[PDB]
Amino acid sequence: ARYLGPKLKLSRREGTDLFLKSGVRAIDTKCKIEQAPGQHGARKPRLSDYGVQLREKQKVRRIYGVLERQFRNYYKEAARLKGNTGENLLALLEGRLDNVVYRMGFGATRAEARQLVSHKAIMVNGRVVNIASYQVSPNDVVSIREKAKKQSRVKAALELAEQREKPTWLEVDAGKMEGTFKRKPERSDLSADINEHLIVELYSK
Template identity: 40%
Template structure:
């Protein structure tokens, strides 16, 4: 399954939650599923509830299904609780780091910054958003990229408050990882145990 490129607000309405990595737009008054029957209350099955939790992660971080499955398998083999480890691995993606540092309004936009080589990681120009960051890693925005209207708007007023696991120097357009992210610092509600149970019977 390829990466989703369709209407983002429609996805958030279907999942019933605002996903800051997917879109800056709020749900507003239309916080019900899209479609002519969206306002009718529907009772979801146990499978449906678990699917929604899984889709929250996939859509917010902009992953394909196969990418999320690979991360789940890695998290399952780790010593830490699977759900917590999965969220840690997702938060440690470079494109998410750029977004959480306040250089881009969404993860989608952050991935474009990385792909177009606007940033360096530890002094090296990179263009792969899935690179996994570690404690001490530093990103710096290139000189020519610091005048971009999107960057200037976001650096002064980021979409989200910056998490405690990174430190951002707005004057230098840089950010450093101070510690590994914790599962409780994810910027939207998700039941990671439902995600674990969803994949437990499918992988």
């Protein structure tokens, strides 16, 4: 299910920083970004329409860590909702539990947040959840149980939370590690760069 491989090769493959190597350290420049995705990365591709659709889809997926059948299930869930499909799809991607744990700063990278959810540490509404694909309902409270609280791995990785944008739609206590979930995020608030329209194009055909 999980990739568990070259998480920094994917950032060179898409060109943009996928935040898979976020970490305690800052922007690395240790892998020759944008100029070497692989062995023949010096070639300039033709880069057609289906090409940019597939690159955008795999970019959003390797940001969010979602497999293809699972993301197709998210698209099928977002297609039957109201409003528009493009905002609803990114809202369902943000509604994952490991993404909420990542936005709280409880862990440096996304796989660390997925491991923190999976190892019976992340607890929402008094009920411990192991599945990282937990659809977070509005008006919930997420925290860490006392037997797994602050064994330093949440601690220094919380300092990275002092360097992030710290978005509006969720609030962290940062004294007892008790987060608080709020209303659904607007499209003009989440990362301002990814394109949902190419994903709609690829899953519409």
